[PDB]
């Protein structure tokens, strides 16, 4: 028998879209009030539900939720490309920057691009130039689908970076300089 709250959850007007979203790999942070609240409220039960698919519903230490599939996932799996990962780690580096607090967490394609060239070995950066600036718009587009970024318009220009980027941060102990560790990750 299925718990009373599980049902109540699946019966919530918010479940359907969230469910689709969660299965696509999207991370639900706080700049998405209604949904996030929803998962905080039924985490215990949605946890069980998604387990049935061999997918763990996880709340990260920084607070966002996301499904992490196992090897036996019954949900179609896809995979980000090296450039997508690289971009994510760079988005994390940015979020860590002090400027971020004085920009309402807003950055530009160029800034991202600048920081990208600076830290990632520009030689391996070719593995996948004005094209490489357009291809970074792609990664940044999928990452937006994943809930890492929010666009300040329909275009790309400037975007807002959320706390879900930590999915891309480096293992850090209290006292470890996050930026040094992050670019050490980006670098190795």
């Amino acid at each position: 028998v299925m718990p009373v709250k599980l049902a109540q959850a699946l019966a919530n007007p918010l479940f359907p879209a969230l469910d689709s979203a969660l299965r696509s790999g999207r991370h639900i942070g706080l700049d998405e009030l209604d949904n996030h609240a929803f998962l905080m409220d039924f985490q215990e039960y949605l946890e069980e539900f998604y387990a049935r698919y061999n997918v763990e519903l996880i709340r990260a230490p920084e607070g966002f939720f996301y499904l992490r599939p196992r090897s036996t996932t019954l949900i179609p799996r896809s995979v980000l490309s090296e450039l997508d990962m690289m971009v994510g780690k760079i988005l994390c580096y940015l979020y860590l920057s002090p400027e971020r607090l004085a920009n309402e967490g807003i950055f530009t394609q160029q800034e991202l691009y600048d920081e990208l060239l600076t830290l990632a070995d520009e030689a391996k950066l070719l593995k996948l130039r004005q094209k490489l600036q357009e291809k970074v718009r792609s990664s940044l587009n999928r990452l937006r689908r994943l809930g890492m970024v929010w666009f300040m318009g329909h275009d790309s220009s400037k975007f807002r970076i959320t706390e879900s980027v930590f999915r891309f941060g480096a293992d850090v102990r209290a006292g470890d300089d996050p930026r040094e560790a992050q670019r050490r990750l980006i670098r190795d």
Partner: protein, 315 residues
Amino acid sequence: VPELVAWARKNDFSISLPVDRLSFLLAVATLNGEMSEGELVDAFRHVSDAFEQTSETIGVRANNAINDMVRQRLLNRFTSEQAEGNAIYRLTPLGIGITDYYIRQREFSTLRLSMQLSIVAGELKRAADAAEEGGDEFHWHRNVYAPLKYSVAEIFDSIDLTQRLMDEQQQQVKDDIAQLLNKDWRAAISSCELLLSETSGTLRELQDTLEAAGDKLQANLLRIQDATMTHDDLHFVDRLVFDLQSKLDRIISWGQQSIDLWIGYDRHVHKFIRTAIDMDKNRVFAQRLRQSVQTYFDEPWALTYANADRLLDMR
């Protein structure tokens, strides 16, 4: 084993029997039931007629063929200065093989098969009552090896040939049903169901007659092996026993596999009669689908379908 091709290429083994020559070979094999080059040319003449052609080259052709028959080893020549044509001719093993296939009568009778099986059972018993007893080489050669190789293995091979003729039969009904359904659609159902039923019966019968016998035959074949396996001299009387047991099994097995396969085809045909014909009695849909294919580009369309985004993972 690829030596086979070397050998085959060296001796340049080939068979080339267009419907043209085959009739000849058959006509010949027909009459053969010795042959002089004379009678052999007559035959070719009668076949030449059936194809209403030239007579100017009949002489040269008829001989041209006979040589072909001789190079391809279908025919064996024997110079006989006194026979008409100064030559005599005999169909070869290859010649008789190929011709029987096109003339020998069918043999799908259940009674036939049981009689064969009854006859085999007796010999296989006698060879067991004796090979158990014992004796000199002559005893084991004339009262054990002799009936197992010149009579038993021979009857098995015959049973093996009946099954293959049955495989042929099987294909035929399949081709016939294709033809029947493709031409009379709904009207051919009752006919097709009958051919499906008639064949299943035949198969079921031969196989049931076989299996019912198997166990006993295999039993005596096991007695003959119990005396032969000890002695280190009666080997030849074992590679035979082992050989027949192995062949009796191959026959009982295929008999079974044959029926499994048939049951499958039968199911498939029925499902088809249900899906394709009962749901399109006037046979219109198939015609329309076909027209819709050639005329598709005139006004193209496409089916929709759920396509959830996959789960974008890390790494």
